Amino acid sequence: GDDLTEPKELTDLFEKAKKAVIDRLHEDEKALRARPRCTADKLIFRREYGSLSKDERLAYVNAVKCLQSKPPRTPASVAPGARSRFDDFVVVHIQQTLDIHYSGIFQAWHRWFVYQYEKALRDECGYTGYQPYWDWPKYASAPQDSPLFNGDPYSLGGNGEYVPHDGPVIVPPEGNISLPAGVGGGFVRTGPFANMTVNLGPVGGLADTAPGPQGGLGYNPRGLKRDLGGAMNTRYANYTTVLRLLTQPDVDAFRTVSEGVPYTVEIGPHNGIHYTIGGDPGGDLFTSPGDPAFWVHHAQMDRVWATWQALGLLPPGDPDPARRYTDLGKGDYAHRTWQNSPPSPFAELSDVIDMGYAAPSTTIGAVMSTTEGELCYFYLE
Ligand SMILES: *[C@@H]1O[C@H](CO)[C@@H](O[C@@H]2O[C@H](CO)[C@@H](O)[C@H](O)[C@H]2NC(C)=O)[C@H](O)[C@H]1NC(C)=O
Ligand SMILES: *[C@@H]1O[C@H](CO)[C@@H](O)[C@H](O)[C@H]1NC(C)=O
Ligand SMILES: *[C@@H]1O[C@H](CO)[C@@H](O)[C@H](O)[C@H]1NC(C)=O
Ligand SMILES: [Cu+2]
Numbered sequence: 565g566d567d568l569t570e571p572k573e574l575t576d577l578f579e580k581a582k583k584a585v586i587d588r589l590h591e592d593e594k595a596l597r598a599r600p601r602c603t604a605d606k607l608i609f610r611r612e613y614g615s616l617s618k619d620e621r622l623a624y625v626n627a628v629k630c631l632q633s634k635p636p637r638t639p640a641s642v643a644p645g646a647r648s649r650f651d652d653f654v655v656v657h658i659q660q661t662l663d664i665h666y667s668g669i670f671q672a673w674h675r676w677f678v679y680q681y682e683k684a685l686r687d688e689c690g691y692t693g694y695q696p697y698w699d700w701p702k703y704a705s706a707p708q709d710s711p712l713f714n715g716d717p718y719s720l721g722g723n724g725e726y727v728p729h730d731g732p733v734i735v736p737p738e739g740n741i742s743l744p745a746g747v748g749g750g751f752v753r754t755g756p757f758a759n760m761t762v763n764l765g766p767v768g769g770l771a772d773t774a775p776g777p778q779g780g781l782g783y784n785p786r787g788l789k790r791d792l793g794g795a796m797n798t799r800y801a802n803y804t805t806v807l808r809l810l811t812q813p814d815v816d817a818f819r820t821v822s823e824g825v826p827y828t829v830e831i832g833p834h835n836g837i838h839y840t841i842g843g844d845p846g847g848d849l850f851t852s853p854g855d856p857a858f859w860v861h862h863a864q865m866d867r868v869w870a871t872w873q874a875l876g877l878l879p880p881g882d883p884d885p886a887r888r889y890t891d892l893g894k895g896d897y898a899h900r901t902w903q904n905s906p907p908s909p910f911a912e913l914s915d916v917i918d919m920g921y922a923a924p925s926t927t928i929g930a931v932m933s934t935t936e937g938e939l940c941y942f943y944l945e
């Protein structure tokens with residue numbers, strides 16, 4: 565209804581944000597030349613998956629397949645199940661999952677993760693485009709019918725086949741929250757990732773999968789499963805969710821909407837979309853990058869963060885327009901530990917983003933702006 569229709573208020577926020585980025589890049593380029601790594605000349609825009617041509621979609625799909633057929637950098641002793649460069653990215657996410665969620669590094673870490681995946685597609689696999697994004701609210705009633713997941717030759721593969729199952733149950737550790745099922749739950753049998761082989765994980769057990777060998781870093785080849793449906797997507801990632809997210813006053817409020825409140829009914833669009841993918845390995849937070857769907861999800865997470873950061877450049881807008889480019893927050897998610905359990909120092913801009921064997925490491929500070937450091941991109945509506 566309301567929540568499944570794109571309000572003009574939201575369309576305007578994306579437009580104001582892109583204009584702020586372009587105006588600021590013009591000025592910054594001139595200031596630097598007067599005495600430049602990113603310019604409005606060099607700026608690329610990541611695109612909405614369904615906006616790409618069939619050829620552009622096919623180029624993306626084939627680059628991903630290429631990365632799944634390139635030999636790994638991860639030593640066999642570190643991850644016996646890593647067979648490919650694609651698996652190298654799964655390995656580092658598995659290794660660091662307990663540190664890089666509900667922590668100060670989460671957004672910066674995942675931004676650089678997506679950038680390094682995109683870079684490997686381009687530099688190692690000859691991809692000529694950029695990482696597309698999953699516009700969550702655009703297909704919320706039926707993501708399995710979208711160009712991302714319709715099972716056509718330009719998709720990332722279809723839904724898992726229907727298998728009767730209950731939605732996931734969140735059990736608070738030392739009341740229970742039952743979430744709605746999608747309309748899949750079995751093996752993906754359509755599109756380019758029909759019968760895709762998943763090598764690593766799961767780290768957790770899933771409904772139909774035992775925890776994988778060597779804590780999910782061993783070799784466990786098995787079919788891709790998904791449980792796409794509108795129930796989780798609609799409930800947790802609609803146009804009202806995105807408008808609420810972009811209108812938050814600071815990073816701690818932003819991330820409370822985005823990442824939810826653990827062991828409550830409000831899981832946020834980040835976990836909402838993870839559960840929307842569901843299946844195997846999407847149901848396992850550790851191994852979630854083992855589904856190509858992960859990357860269009862995290863490109864959207866990055867897009868909403870980068871948009872929100874740019875909205876800070878407007879007149880009040882933040883008094884210090886640099887604030888959203890420097891502020892890692894002061895709340896429960898702003899520390900070097902998951903929800904600050906156990907209590908740990910605040911995340912700092914000087915903190916290392918460790919990409920393990922997958923890719924070069926950097927600092928949080930180096931990735932706070934999509935048009936600074938090595939980064940020169942934004943997003944197109
Ligand atoms: C769109 O997303 C928002 C969450 O981002 C949903 O909001 C909540 O809905 C229930 C309504 O029954 C309330 O009890 C909660 O207080 C609301 N949560 C928040 C965080 O506002 C909204 O329901 C979603 N729309 C649809 C159609 O599911
Ligand atoms: C919560 O769910 C778990 C497993 O899903 C179950 O074993 C446990 O008993 C449940 N607790 C209650 C009070 O329902
Ligand atoms: C996928 O695997 C099934 C079950 O092994 C097989 O029968 C089917 O032909 C395969 N489909 C594709 C598109 O490869
Ligand atoms: Cu993650």
Ligand SMILES: [Cu+2]
Pocket residue numbers: 834838852862
């Ligand atoms: Cu994630």
